[PDB]
Amino acid sequence: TKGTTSMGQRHGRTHILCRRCGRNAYHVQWERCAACAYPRASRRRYNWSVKAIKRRRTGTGRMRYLKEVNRRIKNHFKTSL
């Protein structure tokens, strides 16, 4: 009964959403993320999967501050007194 009848046997969740990546990759029983490797400080990142490095690298998001500091370096951090 390894097919459709054992699909009914599966009831839990292995993964809930991660607090960091927001991926449904937080292994609730081993409280870590399969994606970001969270709670480990350094986020998970492998060179055998650059399609995934690319997928979540900087610029993938708002770059919310990085846009500000980029503009500033371009303007020599010009400042009002």
């Binding site: 500091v69 500033r72 370096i73 951090f77 400042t79």
Partner: protein, 113 residues
Amino acid sequence: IRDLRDKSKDELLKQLMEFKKELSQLRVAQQLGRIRLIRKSIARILTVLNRNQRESLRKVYAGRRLRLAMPKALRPKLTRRRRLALKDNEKNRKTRRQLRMARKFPRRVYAVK
């Protein structure tokens, strides 16, 4: 809006609450056009109002003696690197021998006919 800056602290604060109290009432009306115009006037008062404090804490901490004690929100942020980098004040330092051996042989200008 220049008029918004002539106002003193509380004169702003009193001017501000009447906007919020009136911004709210547009929200009541909305549930059943000026709301944008109000919302951005509230933002002007917080702009003017948050400026007087930063302009008066740069005043509290003006002078070398307290500049190290300055709140770092007010301390001149650059990049983490521009701050941790050697300043020219300490970058251009040269050992006393070098200082003398650069005076003794200055990069004297020359041409060759």
